[PDB]
Amino acid sequence: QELVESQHLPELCPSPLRLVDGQTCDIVNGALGSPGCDHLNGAEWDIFIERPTAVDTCYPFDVPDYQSLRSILANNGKFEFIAEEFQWSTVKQNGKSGACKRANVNDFFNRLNWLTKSDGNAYPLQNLTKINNGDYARLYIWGVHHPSTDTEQTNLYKNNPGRVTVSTKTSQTSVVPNIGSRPWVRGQSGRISFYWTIVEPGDLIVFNTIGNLIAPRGHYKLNSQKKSTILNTAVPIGSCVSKCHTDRGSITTTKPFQNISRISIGDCPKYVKQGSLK
Amino acid sequence: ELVESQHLPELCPSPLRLVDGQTCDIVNGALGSPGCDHLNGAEWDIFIERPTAVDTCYPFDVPDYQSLRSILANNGKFEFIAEEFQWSTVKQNGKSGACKRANVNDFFNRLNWLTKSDGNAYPLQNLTKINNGDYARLYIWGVHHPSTDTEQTNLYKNNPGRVTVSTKTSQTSVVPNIGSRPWVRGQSGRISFYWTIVEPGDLIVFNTIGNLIAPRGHYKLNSQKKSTILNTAVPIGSCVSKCHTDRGSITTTKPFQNISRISIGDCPKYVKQGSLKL
Amino acid sequence: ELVESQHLPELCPSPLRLVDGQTCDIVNGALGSPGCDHLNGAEWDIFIERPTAVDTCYPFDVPDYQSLRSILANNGKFEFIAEEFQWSTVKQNGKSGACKRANVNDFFNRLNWLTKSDGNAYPLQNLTKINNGDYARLYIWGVHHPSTDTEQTNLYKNNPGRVTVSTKTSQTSVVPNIGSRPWVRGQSGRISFYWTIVEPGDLIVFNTIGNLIAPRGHYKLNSQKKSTILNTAVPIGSCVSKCHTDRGSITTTKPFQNISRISIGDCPKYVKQGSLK
Amino acid sequence: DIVMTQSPSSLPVTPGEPASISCRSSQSLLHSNGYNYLDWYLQKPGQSPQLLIYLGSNRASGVPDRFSGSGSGTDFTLKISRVEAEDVGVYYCKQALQTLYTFGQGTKLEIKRTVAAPSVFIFPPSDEQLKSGTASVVCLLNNFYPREAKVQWKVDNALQSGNSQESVTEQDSKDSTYSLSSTLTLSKADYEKHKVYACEVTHQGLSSPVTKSFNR
Amino acid sequence: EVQLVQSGAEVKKPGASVKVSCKVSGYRLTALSMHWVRQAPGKGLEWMGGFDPEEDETIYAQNFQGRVTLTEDTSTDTVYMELSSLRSEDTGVYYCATLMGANPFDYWGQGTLIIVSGASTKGPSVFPLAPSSKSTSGGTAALGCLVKDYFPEPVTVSWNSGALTSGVHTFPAVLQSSGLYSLSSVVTVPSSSLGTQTYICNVNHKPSNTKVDKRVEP
Ligand SMILES: *[C@@H]1O[C@H](CO)[C@@H](O[C@@H]2O[C@H](CO)[C@@H](O[C@@H]3O[C@H](CO)[C@@H](O)[C@H](O)[C@@H]3O)[C@H](O)[C@H]2NC(C)=O)[C@H](O)[C@H]1NC(C)=O
Ligand SMILES: *[C@@H]1O[C@H](CO)[C@@H](O[C@@H]2O[C@H](CO)[C@@H](O[C@@H]3O[C@H](CO)[C@@H](O)[C@H](O)[C@@H]3O)[C@H](O)[C@H]2NC(C)=O)[C@H](O)[C@H]1NC(C)=O
Ligand SMILES: *[C@@H]1O[C@H](CO)[C@@H](O[C@@H]2O[C@H](CO)[C@@H](O[C@@H]3O[C@H](CO)[C@@H](O)[C@H](O)[C@@H]3O)[C@H](O)[C@H]2NC(C)=O)[C@H](O)[C@H]1NC(C)=O
Ligand SMILES: *[C@@H]1O[C@H](CO)[C@@H](O[C@@H]2O[C@H](CO)[C@@H](O[C@@H]3O[C@H](CO)[C@@H](O)[C@H](O)[C@@H]3O)[C@H](O)[C@H]2NC(C)=O)[C@H](O)[C@H]1NC(C)=O
Ligand SMILES: *[C@@H]1O[C@H](CO)[C@@H](O[C@@H]2O[C@H](CO)[C@@H](O[C@@H]3O[C@H](CO)[C@@H](O)[C@H](O)[C@@H]3O)[C@H](O)[C@H]2NC(C)=O)[C@H](O)[C@H]1NC(C)=O
Ligand SMILES: *[C@@H]1O[C@H](CO)[C@@H](O[C@@H]2O[C@H](CO)[C@@H](O)[C@H](O)[C@H]2NC(C)=O)[C@H](O)[C@H]1NC(C)=O
């Protein structure tokens, strides 16, 4: 009897594990809410099916410690966004860009708020504090804008240079904008660096900025007991029934081993290198 | 899509318990023809009967063949209960060259071929078996049909013979039909096998003056008869499915299938050819 | 060999100007159905209509559908001219759930759904347009068909209604047919679209007491009409050919071909098949 | 055979209000697939049957979102969020498990109306009809609700049977009334053999039966 | 989409044999299971038989006593339903449909009305319904017309050449045991209009080229 399974299904089984197809959106742009990611709103999954053919559909961004945020989102298992009112003073809100247009209408990340200087040429110190008086942990996603020239920095937020400072009771992250021209991406040379902060129940979070703040419009509910994961595969989702899934397809077998793919999720046999004897 | 059209290239041995008949159909497995020893004591949810199966013993036929085949499969086990039968004077353990096991003339290991004694005596046999147990019994017996009137008297003295099996509410009596029949496995004579179910508290009487293929015991009949039989040449693999067809197993959440009319278990409702979407 | 039997697996976008309708056929593109905005202002020598097209708005039927399809294709462009229509009292910009545009109940962006006012009044609308321009105008208008008598009164007060459009040498009137019909896109009613061509110097009159799917303007009709339509699922490639079939383009010097009857442009004669020259 | 017992039989519902029709079978309609093989049909007035809910709760193609189904085993239910005039007719539930399909009795969906009362009239045969050798006495029930009504004929105060045939109009489009006509066909001989004629009417709106009579 | 077209209406005298057609356009019958359901007028749906994909055999409902005969022509893609030994209760609409329990689709046909009554084309006989004397204390007049003994359907009944439409109730016809239809058509008018207005019902029966009028007087 052969002990190594070598044949996988040509599809991913949506049963019994609850799968969610990110389609054009990876899990990061889904949390940011880039154009075309609105279908993931309120979704819950046991496995997030991320596609390798995913595309960026907004401002050119980069995430310091990208894999950690990607892991926190997938390990949560849901996109439950709670909108909050942030009393930003004087500054302009709802900044939009041509590199992030929905139906040729300049827009932005629907979960973020691009703050800009007022028409009176004023960007005062913004000091906002949110208290987590609930029974769940909050996840705040905020960004820092990096303009191209010293002219752009003053034309958008007046103050030069800017500063972004998000702090809790036991931590503090402070970033200074890195003004400089970068390669052209999606029609613009500027970049936005996104960060995240987790606020436990009973903790506080303080947004303190003098410019370049990509303000959050709320927070995501962090599951009390987080599970689920993510699989970056191009295999389509079929109609089979299996609790084993790989980046090359699902597996329906009783054999204890398999030489298909290391990337296995769920009730899957242990991966072996190659070969099969008895 | 609501019609599943793709089946697996194998029969899943899990979770349903499958038993491979291999060279024996379920009928020779009950009679105990050569090669049918691997089924002794087997239990199955689905008996897999191969079309390539062949007859390996005496040329025989079963009046109402499909009923006995259904009874053997619906029971779901081969639990023989041997019994001592006090046959008087007559010879026992008849063997045939058309039933060679290990190049040795043999017979059905569940049947006993009674022949006349060396003193040319085949007296009347009137044996009675009382079912004083807690389960229904299944007795399988046969009637030999010689080729010529000379063969009839050479084997059983009396011409014509007679086989009469009776219970409290039923009686089946057969007179041998003599006549040279087409050459099958080197023999023109044939055997007609019959069966009789004896309920607990009922009796059975084997009364013969010749041509009786006597049973060596009986099979246990389960109180709950839930198994079935599937005749297919598809091999048994290592997949996991509760749906099986004569073309292979199916793993799907779809509500319909256009693969095969023959389906067993947790299977989608069969539809005619074709398949569209919603 | 005198019979070309091998076609290309794609449609050549050169030299002829091709326009892919994609999810929209040429009719929903003219009506301005959802997802058909990519055709606004497009010009074509051959309109590539996809068989896998889908109705994206209100369920509708068009009498003499093939003729209007030929008129739009033969024209060769979607040049819409918006006109202000002074509808009195009645409600305008009627939207339906069977025509969701980005999860928002919308309607044909070239048509205006007139409804009764909140004061329960549908006055006789008698508007007229004069074609003072030098180009013939193509007006597309519809007639709504409710499912019950209650739906007719709840929408247009007047039971029954009437839709009448007339020019100098024509007058077409329609009476709404009321009846429950098969559920199509979450709707039991239907709309019957009609068209009227107005020559330079001619006039057109829209006269209704109810059930009018009013046009928001008119399409420009080219003086010369030289374009056509091709209904095929073959994708558009990068080859160079002046011959196109529903099975693909053809690049050959042979005088005959046994590939497809449906050929457009500089194409060899479609012979009745053939094994040899 | 599997028996389908739809309830209720008549479902008067106000437009813009919800409704519910329960379909109860006699055997489990749950295949091992977990797919409850039961469908919901709607036969609109003067129309071929059409499908609304398939496979227990899955909404059929093009069906409005207001329709919805639920249930399992031997108990199922069809629901409409906001009933409208487009939803009038009689609904039937099938049975897809056994291919010997057994439909239900059907639930008629009327529009709720004030109870009101039936206006009863009687029309003696014409002298021109009796010239040909036949007498037909027509009884009229005008504008009543609900549809259920009992019409009894009495010749010389003796109850008749088998010699009458009644018909009812559809639900009116404005006041949602029904109208029923009952004609009593007699031969010219038996018509003159008696004189007292009556037509008794029993209805929900009537506290006591109403009788209209004539003597000729 | 699949289109099911049924044959035209059929009228056969009792004891004969009907043969209903059902042509499928849009899908091969070789890949479709066809069924048949009739509905008696004023009643409910009744399953008659059809084809079961499993077991692979046209199953007929035994309640129809084997009178049903289902034959299929795969060349024309047409199903034939033959009901023999026609009785007075076999009148109604007969549908052909690819029911969901057998095929993933669920389409129906327009229906083939089968009238079993034995007769020929006959014009109607109109008799006025005199103003009801039992309308006492009613304050409203009740009058009508009796269209009796005609075949086949339909008849169009107007009042005063279509001028009178308010309070008009044209009752559906009934099929008498003789094989002829009969309906009543009544109108409600003010009682004072009894001696001031003349009412006349206009009955039209196209199958017999009959257009008779009738005066309704006290
Ligand atoms: C920004 O807004 C926050 C929230 O209102 C405030 O920060 C806090 O400011 C107080 C002084 O006003 C700091 O001292 C604290 O005072 C409280 C009240 O007397 C006292 O209970 C504490 O023990 C402490 O002494 C406090 O540290 C500070 N909290 C921070 C910075 O997290 C204030 O309105 C603004 N703060 C700044 C730095 O702009
Ligand atoms: C994963 O494991 C499978 C088997 O579980 C490997 O399949 C291999 O497939 C090749 C096909 O060319 C087999 O080659 C054959 O070898 C026999 C040896 O006697 C020879 O007689 C035949 O002519 C043919 O060359 C190979 O045996 C088979 N390996 C087994 C059965 O262990 C597969 O290569 C493994 N790796 C991957 C990446 O799939
Ligand atoms: C073969 O052996 C069996 C078992 O010994 C015989 O069965 C029994 O035969 C006796 C004698 O014929 C039966 O007795 C009879 O009982 C009935 C009442 O039931 C009575 O009316 C008769 O006068 C007689 O006494 C006995 O019932 C029967 N066993 C059963 C369970 O019925 C059988 O007869 C033997 N056959 C031959 C051919 O020897
Ligand atoms: C059972 O259902 C399946 C699924 O609908 C049916 O499959 C159909 O198979 C035909 C085979 O000719 C497909 O047509 C062509 O297939 C080729 C494959 O190379 C493809 O390149 C063409 O574009 C075209 O699709 C067909 O697409 C496929 N599906 C449908 C909906 O027809 C199968 O035929 C059914 N079995 C029976 C016995 O009816
Ligand atoms: C809808 O509005 C249009 C606006 O042009 C009306 O069309 C034209 O209206 C004028 C009004 O003076 C009509 O002129 C009249 O013509 C008759 C016959 O020649 C003449 O005897 C009068 O003295 C007066 O000059 C003109 O005929 C008419 N053109 C048409 C009807 O084609 C139209 O009448 C309006 N329709 C409604 C229903 O309101
Ligand atoms: C068009 O003509 C060509 C040329 O004869 C045909 O091609 C033949 O097709 C058959 C069928 O597969 C092959 O066996 C031959 O080898 C092909 N070549 C020749 C020279 O016969 C083609 O079939 C024709 N097409 C049609 C639709 O009739």
JSON list of C-alpha atoms in Angstrom, two decimals, chain C residues 24-83:
[
{"chain": "C", "resi": 24, "resn": "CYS", "atom": "CA", "xyz": [-22.98, 45.20, -23.56]},
{"chain": "C", "resi": 25, "resn": "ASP", "atom": "CA", "xyz": [-24.51, 44.44, -26.94]},
{"chain": "C", "resi": 26, "resn": "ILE", "atom": "CA", "xyz": [-25.18, 47.35, -29.30]},
{"chain": "C", "resi": 27, "resn": "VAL", "atom": "CA", "xyz": [-28.70, 47.91, -27.93]},
{"chain": "C", "resi": 28, "resn": "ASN", "atom": "CA", "xyz": [-27.92, 48.33, -24.23]},
{"chain": "C", "resi": 29, "resn": "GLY", "atom": "CA", "xyz": [-25.00, 50.48, -25.37]},
{"chain": "C", "resi": 30, "resn": "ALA", "atom": "CA", "xyz": [-27.39, 52.84, -27.15]},
{"chain": "C", "resi": 31, "resn": "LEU", "atom": "CA", "xyz": [-29.89, 52.77, -24.27]},
{"chain": "C", "resi": 32, "resn": "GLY", "atom": "CA", "xyz": [-27.02, 53.48, -21.86]},
{"chain": "C", "resi": 33, "resn": "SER", "atom": "CA", "xyz": [-27.47, 50.45, -19.63]},
{"chain": "C", "resi": 34, "resn": "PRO", "atom": "CA", "xyz": [-25.20, 49.87, -16.61]},
{"chain": "C", "resi": 35, "resn": "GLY", "atom": "CA", "xyz": [-21.67, 48.91, -17.55]},
{"chain": "C", "resi": 36, "resn": "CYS", "atom": "CA", "xyz": [-22.14, 50.34, -21.06]},
{"chain": "C", "resi": 37, "resn": "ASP", "atom": "CA", "xyz": [-20.52, 53.72, -20.35]},
{"chain": "C", "resi": 38, "resn": "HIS", "atom": "CA", "xyz": [-17.27, 52.54, -21.97]},
{"chain": "C", "resi": 39, "resn": "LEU", "atom": "CA", "xyz": [-18.98, 52.97, -25.36]},
{"chain": "C", "resi": 40, "resn": "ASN", "atom": "CA", "xyz": [-20.00, 56.63, -24.91]},
{"chain": "C", "resi": 41, "resn": "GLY", "atom": "CA", "xyz": [-18.38, 58.56, -27.75]},
{"chain": "C", "resi": 42, "resn": "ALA", "atom": "CA", "xyz": [-16.82, 55.50, -29.40]},
{"chain": "C", "resi": 43, "resn": "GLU", "atom": "CA", "xyz": [-16.47, 55.14, -33.17]},
{"chain": "C", "resi": 44, "resn": "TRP", "atom": "CA", "xyz": [-16.17, 51.84, -35.01]},
{"chain": "C", "resi": 45, "resn": "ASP", "atom": "CA", "xyz": [-15.95, 50.28, -38.44]},
{"chain": "C", "resi": 46, "resn": "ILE", "atom": "CA", "xyz": [-17.02, 46.93, -36.95]},
{"chain": "C", "resi": 47, "resn": "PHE", "atom": "CA", "xyz": [-18.90, 46.64, -33.65]},
{"chain": "C", "resi": 48, "resn": "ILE", "atom": "CA", "xyz": [-17.75, 43.41, -31.98]},
{"chain": "C", "resi": 49, "resn": "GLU", "atom": "CA", "xyz": [-20.86, 42.23, -30.13]},
{"chain": "C", "resi": 50, "resn": "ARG", "atom": "CA", "xyz": [-20.21, 39.50, -27.59]},
{"chain": "C", "resi": 51, "resn": "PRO", "atom": "CA", "xyz": [-22.59, 36.50, -27.42]},
{"chain": "C", "resi": 52, "resn": "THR", "atom": "CA", "xyz": [-21.95, 36.36, -23.66]},
{"chain": "C", "resi": 53, "resn": "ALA", "atom": "CA", "xyz": [-23.63, 39.75, -23.28]},
{"chain": "C", "resi": 54, "resn": "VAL", "atom": "CA", "xyz": [-26.05, 40.24, -20.40]},
{"chain": "C", "resi": 55, "resn": "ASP", "atom": "CA", "xyz": [-29.01, 42.53, -19.77]},
{"chain": "C", "resi": 56, "resn": "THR", "atom": "CA", "xyz": [-27.90, 44.86, -16.97]},
{"chain": "C", "resi": 57, "resn": "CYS", "atom": "CA", "xyz": [-31.05, 46.97, -16.51]},
{"chain": "C", "resi": 58, "resn": "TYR", "atom": "CA", "xyz": [-34.84, 46.87, -16.67]},
{"chain": "C", "resi": 59, "resn": "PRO", "atom": "CA", "xyz": [-36.32, 43.93, -18.63]},
{"chain": "C", "resi": 60, "resn": "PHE", "atom": "CA", "xyz": [-37.22, 45.29, -22.05]},
{"chain": "C", "resi": 61, "resn": "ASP", "atom": "CA", "xyz": [-38.32, 44.19, -25.51]},
{"chain": "C", "resi": 62, "resn": "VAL", "atom": "CA", "xyz": [-37.89, 46.05, -28.80]},
{"chain": "C", "resi": 63, "resn": "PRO", "atom": "CA", "xyz": [-40.20, 45.63, -31.81]},
{"chain": "C", "resi": 64, "resn": "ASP", "atom": "CA", "xyz": [-38.17, 45.26, -35.01]},
{"chain": "C", "resi": 65, "resn": "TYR", "atom": "CA", "xyz": [-35.08, 44.70, -32.86]},
{"chain": "C", "resi": 66, "resn": "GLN", "atom": "CA", "xyz": [-32.86, 43.64, -35.77]},
{"chain": "C", "resi": 67, "resn": "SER", "atom": "CA", "xyz": [-33.65, 46.81, -37.73]},
{"chain": "C", "resi": 68, "resn": "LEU", "atom": "CA", "xyz": [-32.67, 49.19, -34.92]},
{"chain": "C", "resi": 69, "resn": "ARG", "atom": "CA", "xyz": [-29.60, 47.04, -34.30]},
{"chain": "C", "resi": 70, "resn": "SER", "atom": "CA", "xyz": [-28.74, 47.52, -37.97]},
{"chain": "C", "resi": 71, "resn": "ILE", "atom": "CA", "xyz": [-29.33, 51.28, -37.79]},
{"chain": "C", "resi": 72, "resn": "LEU", "atom": "CA", "xyz": [-27.03, 51.76, -34.79]},
{"chain": "C", "resi": 73, "resn": "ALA", "atom": "CA", "xyz": [-24.31, 49.55, -36.28]},
{"chain": "C", "resi": 74, "resn": "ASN", "atom": "CA", "xyz": [-24.53, 51.01, -39.79]},
{"chain": "C", "resi": 75, "resn": "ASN", "atom": "CA", "xyz": [-24.18, 54.51, -38.32]},
{"chain": "C", "resi": 76, "resn": "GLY", "atom": "CA", "xyz": [-20.91, 53.63, -36.60]},
{"chain": "C", "resi": 77, "resn": "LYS", "atom": "CA", "xyz": [-20.77, 55.91, -33.55]},
{"chain": "C", "resi": 78, "resn": "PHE", "atom": "CA", "xyz": [-22.41, 56.74, -30.22]},
{"chain": "C", "resi": 79, "resn": "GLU", "atom": "CA", "xyz": [-22.62, 60.55, -30.32]},
{"chain": "C", "resi": 80, "resn": "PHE", "atom": "CA", "xyz": [-25.39, 61.49, -27.89]},
{"chain": "C", "resi": 81, "resn": "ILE", "atom": "CA", "xyz": [-26.74, 65.05, -27.81]},
{"chain": "C", "resi": 82, "resn": "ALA", "atom": "CA", "xyz": [-28.47, 65.91, -24.54]},
{"chain": "C", "resi": 83, "resn": "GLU", "atom": "CA", "xyz": [-31.61, 68.04, -24.82]}
]
